[PDB]
Amino acid sequence: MNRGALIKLVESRYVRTDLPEFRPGDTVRVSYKVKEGNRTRIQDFEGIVIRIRRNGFNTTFTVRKVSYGVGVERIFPLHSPLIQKIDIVQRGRARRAKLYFIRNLSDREIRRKLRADRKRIDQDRAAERAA
Amino acid sequence: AKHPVPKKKTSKARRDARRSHHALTPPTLVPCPECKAMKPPHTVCPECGYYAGRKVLEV
Amino acid sequence: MIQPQTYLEVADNTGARKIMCIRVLKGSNAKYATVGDVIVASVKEAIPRGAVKEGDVVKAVVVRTKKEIKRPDGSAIRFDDNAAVIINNQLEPRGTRVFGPVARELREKGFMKIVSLAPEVL
Amino acid sequence: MKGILGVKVGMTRIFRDDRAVPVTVILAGPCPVVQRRTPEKDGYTAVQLGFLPQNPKRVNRPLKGHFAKAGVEPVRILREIRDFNPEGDTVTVEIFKPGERVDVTGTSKGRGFAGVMKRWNFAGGPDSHGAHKIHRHPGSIGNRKTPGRVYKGKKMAGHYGAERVTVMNLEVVDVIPEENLLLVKGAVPGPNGGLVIVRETKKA
Amino acid sequence: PTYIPRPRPPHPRL
Amino acid sequence: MRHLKSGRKLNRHSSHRLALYRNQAKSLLTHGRITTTVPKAKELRGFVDHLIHLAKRGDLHARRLVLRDLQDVKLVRKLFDEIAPRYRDRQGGYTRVLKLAERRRGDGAPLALVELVE
RNA sequence: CGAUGUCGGCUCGUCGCAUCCUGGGGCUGAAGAAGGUCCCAAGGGUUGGGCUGUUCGCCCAUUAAAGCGGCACGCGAGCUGGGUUCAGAACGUCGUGAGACAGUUCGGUCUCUAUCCGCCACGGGCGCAGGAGGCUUGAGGGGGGCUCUUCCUAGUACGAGAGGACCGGAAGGGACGCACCUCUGGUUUCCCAGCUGUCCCUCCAGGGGCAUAAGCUGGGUAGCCAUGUGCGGAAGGGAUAACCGCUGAAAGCAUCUAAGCGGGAAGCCCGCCCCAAGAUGAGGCCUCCCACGGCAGCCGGUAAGGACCCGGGAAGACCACCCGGUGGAUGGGCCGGGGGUGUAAGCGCCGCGAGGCGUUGAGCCGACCGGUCCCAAUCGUCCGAGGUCU
RNA sequence: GAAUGCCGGCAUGAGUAACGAUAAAGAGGGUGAGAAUCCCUCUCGCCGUAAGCCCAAGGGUUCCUACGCAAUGGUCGUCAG
RNA sequence: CGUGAGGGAAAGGUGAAAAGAACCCCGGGAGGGGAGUGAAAUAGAGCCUGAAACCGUGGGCUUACAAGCAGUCACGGCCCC
Ligand SMILES: [Mg+2]
Ligand SMILES: [Mg+2]
Ligand SMILES: [Mg+2]
Ligand SMILES: [Mg+2]
Ligand SMILES: [Mg+2]
Ligand SMILES: [Mg+2]
Ligand SMILES: [Mg+2]
Ligand SMILES: [Mg+2]
Ligand SMILES: [Mg+2]
Ligand SMILES: [Mg+2]
Ligand SMILES: [Mg+2]
Ligand SMILES: [Mg+2]
Ligand SMILES: [Mg+2]
Ligand SMILES: [Mg+2]
Ligand SMILES: [Mg+2]
Ligand SMILES: [Mg+2]
Ligand SMILES: [Mg+2]
Ligand SMILES: [Mg+2]
Ligand SMILES: [Mg+2]
Ligand SMILES: [Mg+2]
Ligand SMILES: [Mg+2]
Ligand SMILES: [Mg+2]
Ligand SMILES: [Mg+2]
Ligand SMILES: [Mg+2]
Ligand SMILES: [Mg+2]
Ligand SMILES: [Mg+2]
Ligand SMILES: [Mg+2]
Ligand SMILES: [Mg+2]
Ligand SMILES: [Mg+2]
Ligand SMILES: [Mg+2]
Ligand SMILES: [Mg+2]
Ligand SMILES: [Mg+2]
Ligand SMILES: [Mg+2]
Ligand SMILES: [Mg+2]
Ligand SMILES: [Mg+2]
Ligand SMILES: [Mg+2]
Ligand SMILES: [Mg+2]
Ligand SMILES: [Mg+2]
Ligand SMILES: [Mg+2]
Ligand SMILES: [Mg+2]
Ligand SMILES: [Mg+2]
Ligand SMILES: [Mg+2]
Ligand SMILES: [Mg+2]
Ligand SMILES: [Mg+2]
Ligand SMILES: [Mg+2]
Ligand SMILES: [Mg+2]
Ligand SMILES: [Mg+2]
Ligand SMILES: [Mg+2]
Ligand SMILES: [Mg+2]
Ligand SMILES: [Mg+2]
Ligand SMILES: [Mg+2]
Ligand SMILES: [Mg+2]
Ligand SMILES: [Mg+2]
Ligand SMILES: [Mg+2]
Ligand SMILES: [Mg+2]
Ligand SMILES: [Mg+2]
Ligand SMILES: [Mg+2]
Ligand SMILES: [Mg+2]
Ligand SMILES: [Mg+2]
Ligand SMILES: [Mg+2]
Ligand SMILES: [Mg+2]
Ligand SMILES: [Mg+2]
Ligand SMILES: [Mg+2]
Ligand SMILES: [Mg+2]
Ligand SMILES: [Mg+2]
Ligand SMILES: [Mg+2]
Ligand SMILES: [Mg+2]
Ligand SMILES: [Mg+2]
Ligand SMILES: [Mg+2]
Ligand SMILES: [Mg+2]
Ligand SMILES: [Mg+2]
Ligand SMILES: [Mg+2]
Ligand SMILES: [Mg+2]
Ligand SMILES: [Mg+2]
Ligand SMILES: [Mg+2]
Ligand SMILES: [Mg+2]
Ligand SMILES: [Mg+2]
Ligand SMILES: [Mg+2]
Ligand SMILES: [Mg+2]
Ligand SMILES: [Mg+2]
Ligand SMILES: [Mg+2]
Ligand SMILES: [Mg+2]
Ligand SMILES: [Mg+2]
Ligand SMILES: [Mg+2]
Ligand SMILES: [Mg+2]
Ligand SMILES: [Mg+2]
Ligand SMILES: [Mg+2]
Ligand SMILES: [Mg+2]
Ligand SMILES: [Mg+2]
Ligand SMILES: [Mg+2]
Ligand SMILES: [Mg+2]
Ligand SMILES: [Mg+2]
Ligand SMILES: [Mg+2]
Ligand SMILES: [Mg+2]
Ligand SMILES: [Mg+2]
Ligand SMILES: [Mg+2]
Ligand SMILES: [Mg+2]
Ligand SMILES: [Mg+2]
Ligand SMILES: [Mg+2]
Ligand SMILES: [Mg+2]
Ligand SMILES: [Mg+2]
Ligand SMILES: [Mg+2]
Ligand SMILES: [Mg+2]
Ligand SMILES: [Mg+2]
Ligand SMILES: [Mg+2]
Ligand SMILES: [Mg+2]
Ligand SMILES: [Mg+2]
Ligand SMILES: [Mg+2]
Ligand SMILES: [Mg+2]
Ligand SMILES: [Mg+2]
Ligand SMILES: [Mg+2]
Ligand SMILES: [Mg+2]
Ligand SMILES: [Mg+2]
Ligand SMILES: [Mg+2]
Ligand SMILES: [Mg+2]
Ligand SMILES: [Mg+2]
Ligand SMILES: [Mg+2]
Ligand SMILES: [Mg+2]
Ligand SMILES: [Mg+2]
Ligand SMILES: [Mg+2]
Ligand SMILES: [Mg+2]
Ligand SMILES: [Mg+2]
Ligand SMILES: [Mg+2]
Ligand SMILES: [Mg+2]
Ligand SMILES: [Mg+2]
Ligand SMILES: [Mg+2]
Ligand SMILES: [Mg+2]
Ligand SMILES: [Mg+2]
Ligand SMILES: [Mg+2]
Ligand SMILES: [Mg+2]
Ligand SMILES: [Mg+2]
Ligand SMILES: [Mg+2]
Ligand SMILES: [Mg+2]
Ligand SMILES: [Mg+2]
Ligand SMILES: [Mg+2]
Ligand SMILES: [Mg+2]
Ligand SMILES: [Mg+2]
Ligand SMILES: [Mg+2]
Ligand SMILES: [Mg+2]
Ligand SMILES: [Mg+2]
Ligand SMILES: [Mg+2]
Ligand SMILES: [Mg+2]
Ligand SMILES: [Mg+2]
Ligand SMILES: [Mg+2]
Ligand SMILES: [Mg+2]
Ligand SMILES: [Mg+2]
Ligand SMILES: [Mg+2]
Ligand SMILES: [Mg+2]
Ligand SMILES: [Mg+2]
Ligand SMILES: [Mg+2]
Ligand SMILES: [Mg+2]
Ligand SMILES: [Mg+2]
Ligand SMILES: [Mg+2]
Ligand SMILES: [Mg+2]
Ligand SMILES: [Mg+2]
Ligand SMILES: [Mg+2]
Ligand SMILES: [Mg+2]
Ligand SMILES: [Mg+2]
Ligand SMILES: [Mg+2]
Ligand SMILES: [Mg+2]
Ligand SMILES: [Mg+2]
Ligand SMILES: [Mg+2]
Ligand SMILES: [Mg+2]
Ligand SMILES: [Mg+2]
Ligand SMILES: [Mg+2]
Ligand SMILES: [Mg+2]
Ligand SMILES: [Mg+2]
Ligand SMILES: [Mg+2]
Ligand SMILES: [Mg+2]
Ligand SMILES: [Mg+2]
Ligand SMILES: [Mg+2]
Ligand SMILES: [Mg+2]
Ligand SMILES: [Zn+2]
Numbered sequence A: 001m002n003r004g005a006l007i008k009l010v011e012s013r014y015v016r017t018d019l020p021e022f023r024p025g026d027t028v029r030v031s032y033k034v035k036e037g038n039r040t041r042i043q044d045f046e047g048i049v050i051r052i053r054r055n056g057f058n059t060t061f062t063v064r065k066v067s068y069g070v071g072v073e074r075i076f077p078l079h080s081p082l083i084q085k086i087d088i089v090q091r092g093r094a095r096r097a098k099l100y101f102i103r104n105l106s107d108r109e110i111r112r113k114l115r116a117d118r119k120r121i122d123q124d125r126a127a128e129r130a131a
Numbered sequence B: 001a002k003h004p005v006p007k008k009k010t011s012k013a014r015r016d017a018r019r020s021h022h023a024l025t026p027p028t029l030v031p032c033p034e035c036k037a038m039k040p041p042h043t044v045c046p047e048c049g050y051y052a053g054r055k056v057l058e059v
Numbered sequence C: 001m002i003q004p005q006t007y008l009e010v011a012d013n014t015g016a017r018k019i020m021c022i023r024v025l026k027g028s029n030a031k032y033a034t035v036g037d038v039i040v041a042s043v044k045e046a047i048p049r050g051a052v053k054e055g056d057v058v059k060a061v062v063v064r065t066k067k068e069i070k071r072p073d074g075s076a077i078r079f080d081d082n083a084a085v086i087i088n089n090q091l092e093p094r095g096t097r098v099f100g101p102v103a104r105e106l107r108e109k110g111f112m113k114i115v116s117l118a119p120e121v122l
Numbered sequence D: 001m002k003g004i005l006g007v008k009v010g011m012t013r014i015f016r017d018d019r020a021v022p023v024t025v026i027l028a029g030p031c032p033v034v035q036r037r038t039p040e041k042d043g044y045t046a047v048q049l050g051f052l053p054q055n056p057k058r059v060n061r062p063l064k065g066h067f068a069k070a071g072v073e074p075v076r077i078l079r080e081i082r083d084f085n086p087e088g089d090t091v092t093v094e095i096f097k098p099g100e101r102v103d104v105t106g107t108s109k110g111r112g113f114a115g116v117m118k119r120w121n122f123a124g125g126p127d128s129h130g131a132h133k134i135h136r137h138p139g140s141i142g143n144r145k146t147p148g149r150v151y152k153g154k155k156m157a158g159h160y161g162a163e164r165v166t167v168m169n170l171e172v173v174d175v176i177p178e179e180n181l182l183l184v185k186g187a188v189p190g191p192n193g194g195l196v197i198v199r200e201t202k203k204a
Numbered sequence E: 001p002t003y004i005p006r007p008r009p010p011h012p013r014l
Numbered sequence F: 001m002r003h004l005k006s007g008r009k010l011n012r013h014s015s016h017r018l019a020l021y022r023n024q025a026k027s028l029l030t031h032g033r034i035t036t037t038v039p040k041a042k043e044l045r046g047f048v049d050h051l052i053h054l055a056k057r058g059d060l061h062a063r064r065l066v067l068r069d070l071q072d073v074k075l076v077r078k079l080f081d082e083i084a085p086r087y088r089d090r091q092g093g094y095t096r097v098l099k100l101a102e103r104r105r106g107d108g109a110p111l112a113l114v115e116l117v118e
Numbered sequence G: 001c002g003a004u005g006u007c008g009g010c011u012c013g014u015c016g017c018a019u020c021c022u023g024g025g026g027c028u029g030a031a032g033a034a035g036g037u038c039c040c041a042a043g044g045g046u047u048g049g050g051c052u053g054u055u056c057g058c059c060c061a062u063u064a065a066a067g068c069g070g071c072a073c074g075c076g077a078g079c080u081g082g083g084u085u086c087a088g089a090a091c092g093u094c095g096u097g098a099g100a101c102a103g104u105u106c107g108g109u110c111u112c113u114a115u116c117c118g119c120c121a122c123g124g125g126c127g128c129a130g131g132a133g134g135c136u137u138g139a140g141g142g143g144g145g146c147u148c149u150u151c152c153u154a155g156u157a158c159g160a161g162a163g164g165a166c167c168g169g170a171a172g173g174g175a176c177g178c179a180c181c182u183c184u185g186g187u188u189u190c191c192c193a194g195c196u197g198u199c200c201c202u203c204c205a206g207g208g209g210c211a212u213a214a215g216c217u218g219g220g221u222a223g224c225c226a227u228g229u230g231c232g233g234a235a236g237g238g239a240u241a242a243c244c245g246c247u248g249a250a251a252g253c254a255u256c257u258a259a260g261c262g263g264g265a266a267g268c269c270c271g272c273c274c275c276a277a278g279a280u281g282a283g284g285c286c287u288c289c290c291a292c293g294g295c296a297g298c299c300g301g302u303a304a305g306g307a308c309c310c311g312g313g314a315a316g317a318c319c320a321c322c323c324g325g326u327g328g329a330u331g332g333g334c335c336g337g338g339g340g341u342g343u344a345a346g347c348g349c350c351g352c353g354a355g356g357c358g359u360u361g362a363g364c365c366g367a368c369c370g371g372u373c374c375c376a377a378u379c380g381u382c383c384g385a386g387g388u389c390u
Numbered sequence H: 001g002a003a004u005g006c007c008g009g010c011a012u013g014a015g016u017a018a019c020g021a022u023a024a025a026g027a028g029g030g031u032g033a034g035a036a037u038c039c040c041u042c043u044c045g046c047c048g049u050a051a052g053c054c055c056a057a058g059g060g061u062u063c064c065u066a067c068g069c070a071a072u073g074g075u076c077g078u079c080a081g
Numbered sequence I: 001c002g003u004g005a006g007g008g009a010a011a012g013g014u015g016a017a018a019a020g021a022a023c024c025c026c027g028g029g030a031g032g033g034g035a036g037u038g039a040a041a042u043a044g045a046g047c048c049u050g051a052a053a054c055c056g057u058g059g060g061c062u063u064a065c066a067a068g069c070a071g072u073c074a075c076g077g078c079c080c081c
Helices: A003-012 A100-104 A107-113 A118-126 B012-021 C112-117 D061-068 D116-120 F014-031 F038-057 F060-070 F073-087
Strands: A027-036 A039-053 A060-067 A070-077 A083-090 C007-010 C016-024 C038-046 C057-064 C076-079 C083-087 D005-015 D020-027 D031-037 D046-053 D075-082 D101-107 D110-114 D158-161 D164-176 D181-185 D195-200 F033-037 F095-103 F110-116
Touching: A003 D005, A003 D020, A003 D181, A027 A070, A039 A070, A039 A100, C007 C038, C016 C057, C016 C083, C038 C083, D005 D046, D005 D181, D020 D164, D031 D061, D031 D075, D075 D195, D110 D116, D116 D158, F014 F033, F014 F038, F014 F060, F014 F073, F014 F110, F033 F038, F038 F060, F038 F073, F038 F095, F038 F110, F060 F073
Parallel strands: C007 C083
Antiparallel strands: A027 A039, A027 A083, A039 A060, A060 A070, A070 C076, C007 C016, C016 C038, C038 C057, C057 C083, D005 D020, D005 D195, D020 D181, D031 D046, D046 D075, D101 D164, D101 D195, D110 D158, D164 D181, F033 F110, F095 F110
16 A cells, blocks of 8 residues: 555645746735634735745645834645735845744845845746747 | 661572573584584584585685 | 733733733732733833823733734633723723733623624624 | 544644644554344444455465455455444544544553553652762652551552553544544544554543 | 771761 | 664764774774674664775765875775775675674673675 | 651642532522522532742732631652751840850751562463464453533513523633644754864865864754644432422321332443453463373474564664565665755856856755665574363 | 681572772774674864973883783773883 | 781691602683593592581472461372382
């Protein structure tokens, strides 16, 4: 028997595929379905993805955003059915996979450290020239 | 600590009874297929240097 | 994860700026308060001519924490600080405004005034 | 009462009504009835099940004649289920429907020789303020001349784990009979690849 | 009988 | 506990153990057969296998990778030029370990031999 | 007195019951709610802080509650050593003085090795009248046992009002316990990158040693984990405590009682979880071997089986346990997936240059999920029934 | 038969604690009855205001060489103060 | 042993005579086994006699459901005379 495969098999019914790949340092907008009793609505959450931890179906990315004066990090599961959509808003360049360091940085030091990834920005514009 | 100590001398019966588990197991031995000399299984034969049916080292 | 001796920024305009938790109002011996939990605190640092003053033993509700809160949908949210809003015995905010985001958890726990006043409920 | 043997596959989580649900996955079926216990011949009721097919070249003669007296291919494991008497000669996971509650037994993970803090959650000693080599120690074990002895059952260090453990009232979450899988919400004793028993719950 | 090791002081039972 | 942990320790800190393996790799690759203890022998297999495999790939990168553990151009030259060619179609298993009948006199240690295969 | 270590704390509990809370009651100057008092009850529970060496006590903030006692005022061959309780020094006081003080003050060496009982774990032996491989019954043990808030019933009963129920029904918590690693969060001693100094290989480029038993720094899989997740306390059956009765004499009435019957606690028996036939009272069921050769005995060759030896294992101190041994995926390699790292070297282009850009999500890559006989578990050896008598 | 008596001998604790800085080792070759422990070479690590070199004190043949391994060396020893 | 003044041991015995064991065997040696000497070699130099504690090999009885200052009394079984 293949225990890994069975796990993969159980998960497949929930694996999303329709989401734009991104990377730590990217600036992204998560549209997240949330309930305000008893109605349900979409709440956008825009920020730098500082961290992505991979575990197949169980991958989860962390997005950081400052909001009315306070730093805020939320963690989303990359296959959660609550994610309505994900929009790439900026493509930044990191030198490492985890960016906890930006928590202690000034606004301009972040901007200096995560300059625009021209190479992947060119790809984003290179696509969207389709049929 | 406060330096524990034996309270009575151990009788010859209790002493040797503790050794009731001290005998040696004679070595596990099997005959070598090539030179028929007795030797432990799963080792190159030290008498003819044969293992798995072939010469493996000089003796 | 707020326990006695923890300092909390004051999220409202009561005049207080820092409070030091001295009790967690959650049963006989709860160890921790998170968002939504009432605490008893001592005013450690207030501004002048405030509704509160240093020394006041006040009640507070924790509105955001440095440790992440988890949620039934598998999501989690964490803030840059532990903050709180000073309340009266009937759980209402003693102040007139709430600065910063607050935990959505405050809604179902019956802090609908504090959730309304917040500039953003995350 | 109904039961079935299985193997712990591993953990993951599904999403059910916009809710993360942690689950353990159990490969349970299929279990051939190998011998039935009757109050006639045996004095109690149970069904000795079988699980996992075995190389015939490894099944000795006393056991071969046992399976043969049931017309079952030789199997690796044989366990009974008390007061369970199925109709067929094969027990499959379709005996569980989603929304049920089950108790799961397994062999807990083996911690070996475990100290009093890991085993019994003793507080240990202080790490500063003059503690002398007692940081993980159990302190006192008794009184003085009265009673002059240590109680039976006193919590001391020693082997911890690799014992029989049963968690009760685990929700069944889904059943995948085509793969003989069983999704249970929560934790189950022991390691992946370990053997489990999945009975109906005795809670209510 | 070379050197006489002096014995430890008693516990003060006063 | 030690559950699912791969790696013998051999009563050596992190840098001694590595130098042990690298010294044993140098000696075995050099002489073709060395005698050591059984536990050391079993660990040297994978350490040495990987180097031989890297030599089969023959690129400059591999040479420099191998030279990190072997540090001897001449020996690395012998590994790439004489040793690696005779394993071109052997998919792994470049070494073998066979236990020895006798023990040392002074510490009773069980020995075994390690050799490159044919 | 040829020594029984002395306060308080820490750790670890276990018992008592004159009960602090929780459960059950009688009386109330008991309307309701909430109290008072006494009875039954020891199953569980009984918080964090400021002061002082403190025990005690007062205080702060909570709580259902913040119970009181025994165990050498439990516990220093378990820890502490602040106090007491040596030698120093000083203050007050006393003494001509040396010195003195239930007067104060600062300081002042706490002993690696457990033999026997006891305790926690783990084997070895023999036994359980034939020998064996499995699967089991449960005598008897052990574990567990707590509790709060909110809502509905209902702003109804009750009450002038304020206030505010029983019974019954929902939801959510604190602490505790068992298990687990999907998520959250730790570590992850060499899994990846970056960095300084220096010595080196081989001059550049690329690298290796050392700077800790990782040089430092940023990360980090498996495993082991809590701060994280699942689940437990029950339900229910039975017999009772105080207490309330039904029927009912002695004793024309009356009486829970003398005949008989009923109700009635978080407590008791059972139920749940775990151990458990050395339960010598050594249990049961399924299946296999079975008249061996020779003098209830013995000595030999076997049987079914077993052990040895080996490759190993979320099993483990040794042992034991579990799996595999070429009719084999057990470990090692190799391959793929995962995962970590975060774009290798080399070359080409740009810049005087530090560098930058592309080739490139590259290169490297522990443990995870699998594949593959490439390497190693070669070859073998030794035990092992012939069934007592009525 | 006792004096924690005196001297000697031999037990118990026990195949137990320990084998004296956590700077560190591996392999090949040689010798020999015998080798983890001696010789040789290669690799690895340690010291380098020292763990290197030279004086004085103190010690008194411990220096060099051959032949030796009972004891001494906390193991072994073919080696050695 | 103590700087020193000073303190202060243990340790006798082959046999009448060395006749003190040529030679051969195992062994590196040690040690033994034969051979030989002697009245005697468990008088073989670790030597007269060779007590006891203490360690061991072999044999007889006995012991793995049993409560112990270890003995004593009784009966029974087994072994020996
Ligand atoms: Mg002590
Ligand atoms: Mg000590
Ligand atoms: Mg000691
Ligand atoms: Mg003893
Ligand atoms: Mg003796
Ligand atoms: Mg004896
Ligand atoms: Mg005796
Ligand atoms: Mg004994
Ligand atoms: Mg012993
Ligand atoms: Mg013995
Ligand atoms: Mg003030
Ligand atoms: Mg002030
Ligand atoms: Mg603010
Ligand atoms: Mg099982
Ligand atoms: Mg535990
Ligand atoms: Mg703990
Ligand atoms: Mg601690
Ligand atoms: Mg101390
Ligand atoms: Mg200690
Ligand atoms: Mg310490
Ligand atoms: Mg401990
Ligand atoms: Mg005491
Ligand atoms: Mg007693
Ligand atoms: Mg176990
Ligand atoms: Mg460890
Ligand atoms: Mg493994
Ligand atoms: Mg060691
Ligand atoms: Mg180092
Ligand atoms: Mg490799
Ligand atoms: Mg071998
Ligand atoms: Mg061997
Ligand atoms: Mg006394
Ligand atoms: Mg005495
Ligand atoms: Mg005495
Ligand atoms: Mg004494
Ligand atoms: Mg007590
Ligand atoms: Mg009472
Ligand atoms: Mg009560
Ligand atoms: Mg009451
Ligand atoms: Mg009352
Ligand atoms: Mg009233
Ligand atoms: Mg009332
Ligand atoms: Mg009680
Ligand atoms: Mg009590
Ligand atoms: Mg208190
Ligand atoms: Mg203070
Ligand atoms: Mg205090
Ligand atoms: Mg106090
Ligand atoms: Mg006081
Ligand atoms: Mg109350
Ligand atoms: Mg005391
Ligand atoms: Mg006490
Ligand atoms: Mg005490
Ligand atoms: Mg002490
Ligand atoms: Mg004390
Ligand atoms: Mg004591
Ligand atoms: Mg003592
Ligand atoms: Mg003191
Ligand atoms: Mg002190
Ligand atoms: Mg004195
Ligand atoms: Mg004076
Ligand atoms: Mg005077
Ligand atoms: Mg004073
Ligand atoms: Mg003092
Ligand atoms: Mg001082
Ligand atoms: Mg004093
Ligand atoms: Mg000291
Ligand atoms: Mg001592
Ligand atoms: Mg003992
Ligand atoms: Mg005793
Ligand atoms: Mg046993
Ligand atoms: Mg039986
Ligand atoms: Mg029972
Ligand atoms: Mg019993
Ligand atoms: Mg109402
Ligand atoms: Mg009214
Ligand atoms: Mg109710
Ligand atoms: Mg994991
Ligand atoms: Mg984790
Ligand atoms: Mg994490
Ligand atoms: Mg993590
Ligand atoms: Mg990890
Ligand atoms: Mg590495
Ligand atoms: Mg390094
Ligand atoms: Mg360098
Ligand atoms: Mg360079
Ligand atoms: Mg160097
Ligand atoms: Mg150095
Ligand atoms: Mg440092
Ligand atoms: Mg690190
Ligand atoms: Mg980390
Ligand atoms: Mg009941
Ligand atoms: Mg009446
Ligand atoms: Mg009546
Ligand atoms: Mg009656
Ligand atoms: Mg009744
Ligand atoms: Mg009843
Ligand atoms: Mg209850
Ligand atoms: Mg059982
Ligand atoms: Mg049983
Ligand atoms: Mg009995
Ligand atoms: Mg039995
Ligand atoms: Mg093992
Ligand atoms: Mg087997
Ligand atoms: Mg075989
Ligand atoms: Mg395999
Ligand atoms: Mg493999
Ligand atoms: Mg791989
Ligand atoms: Mg991958
Ligand atoms: Mg990847
Ligand atoms: Mg590049
Ligand atoms: Mg490149
Ligand atoms: Mg380059
Ligand atoms: Mg140029
Ligand atoms: Mg990658
Ligand atoms: Mg890979
Ligand atoms: Mg195949
Ligand atoms: Mg053989
Ligand atoms: Mg006398
Ligand atoms: Mg005497
Ligand atoms: Mg004497
Ligand atoms: Mg002795
Ligand atoms: Mg002695
Ligand atoms: Mg031993
Ligand atoms: Mg001992
Ligand atoms: Mg020991
Ligand atoms: Mg010692
Ligand atoms: Mg030792
Ligand atoms: Mg030492
Ligand atoms: Mg040494
Ligand atoms: Mg040492
Ligand atoms: Mg170092
Ligand atoms: Mg080497
Ligand atoms: Mg050598
Ligand atoms: Mg040697
Ligand atoms: Mg030697
Ligand atoms: Mg040398
Ligand atoms: Mg220098
Ligand atoms: Mg001189
Ligand atoms: Mg001298
Ligand atoms: Mg010399
Ligand atoms: Mg010489
Ligand atoms: Mg010598
Ligand atoms: Mg010697
Ligand atoms: Mg010698
Ligand atoms: Mg000599
Ligand atoms: Mg010596
Ligand atoms: Mg020696
Ligand atoms: Mg020495
Ligand atoms: Mg030697
Ligand atoms: Mg020589
Ligand atoms: Mg002298
Ligand atoms: Mg002298
Ligand atoms: Mg004399
Ligand atoms: Mg004479
Ligand atoms: Mg004479
Ligand atoms: Mg004569
Ligand atoms: Mg003469
Ligand atoms: Mg000769
Ligand atoms: Mg001789
Ligand atoms: Mg001889
Ligand atoms: Mg002779
Ligand atoms: Mg005569
Ligand atoms: Mg004689
Ligand atoms: Mg004589
Ligand atoms: Mg004479
Ligand atoms: Mg004699
Ligand atoms: Mg003698
Ligand atoms: Mg005997
Ligand atoms: Mg009995
Ligand atoms: Mg008997
Ligand atoms: Mg009689
Ligand atoms: Zn042979």
